């Protein structure tokens, strides 16, 4: 049946105010494979979001890495909104630079 996705939002390289980077949204542990992943800057969808090819784990759940270029600042907030049939709502998880 239906497993609900887990999510880590994190950058590729350690964050530095001003320094361009890649923001990742690693979604794992979900089923069915069809999923919609949006990355948000300040509540707005980031337009050109890269999406890796979808692979499954030995326990049959899928994982994908969503990612996009970005330049973290003191002020801007970033999030990843995952829409999946296993959940009534989307799950939005904010990027934490400490995390």
Partner 1 sequence: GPHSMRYFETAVSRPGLEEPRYISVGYVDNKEFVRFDSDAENPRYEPRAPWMEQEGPEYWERETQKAKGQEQWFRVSLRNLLGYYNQSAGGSHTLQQMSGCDLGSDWRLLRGYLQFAYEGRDYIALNEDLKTWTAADMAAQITRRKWEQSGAAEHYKAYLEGECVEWLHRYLKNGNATLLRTDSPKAHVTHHPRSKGEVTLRCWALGFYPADITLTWQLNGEEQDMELVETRPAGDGTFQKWASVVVPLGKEQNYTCRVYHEGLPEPLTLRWEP
What is the C-alpha separation between 64 and 69, in angstroms, rounded?
Answer: 17
Residue 22 sits in the site that holds partner 1 (CB under 8 A): yes
Residue 6 sits in the site that holds partner 1 (CB under 8 A): yes
What is the C-alpha separation between 63 and 52, in angstroms, rounded?
Answer: 9
Residue 67 sits in the site that holds partner 1 (CB under 8 A): yes
Q: Which of 33, 76, 77, 94 binds partner 1 (CB under 8 A)?
A: 33
Is the alpha carbon torsion for 91, 49, 75, 11 positive or negative?
Answer: positive
Residue 3 sits in the site that holds partner 1 (CB under 8 A): yes
What is the C-alpha separation between 56 and 58, in angstroms, rounded?
Answer: 7
Please count the CA atoms within 13 angstroms of the CA of 53 that sit on its side-chain side: 1
Nearer to partner 1, 43 or 53 (CB): 53
Nearer to partner 1, 76 or 96 (CB): 96
> Which residues bind to partner 1, rule: CB under 8 A?
1-3, 6, 8, 10, 12-14, 22, 24, 26, 28, 31-34, 52-56, 58, 60-61, 65, 67, 98-99
């Amino acid at each position: 049946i239906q497993k609900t996705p887990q999510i880590q939002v994190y950058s590729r390289h350690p964050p530095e105010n001003g320094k361009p980077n890649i923001l990742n949204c690693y979604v794992t542990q979900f089923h069915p494979p069809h999923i919609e992943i949006q990355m948000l800057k300040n509540g707005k969808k980031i337009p050109k979001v890269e999406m890796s090819d979808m692979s499954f784990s030995k326990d049959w759940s899928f994982y994908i890495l969503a990612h996009t270029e970005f330049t973290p600042t003191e002020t801007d907030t970033y999030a990843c909104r995952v829409k999946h049939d296993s959940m009534a709502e989307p799950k939005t998880v904010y990027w934490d630079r400490d995390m």
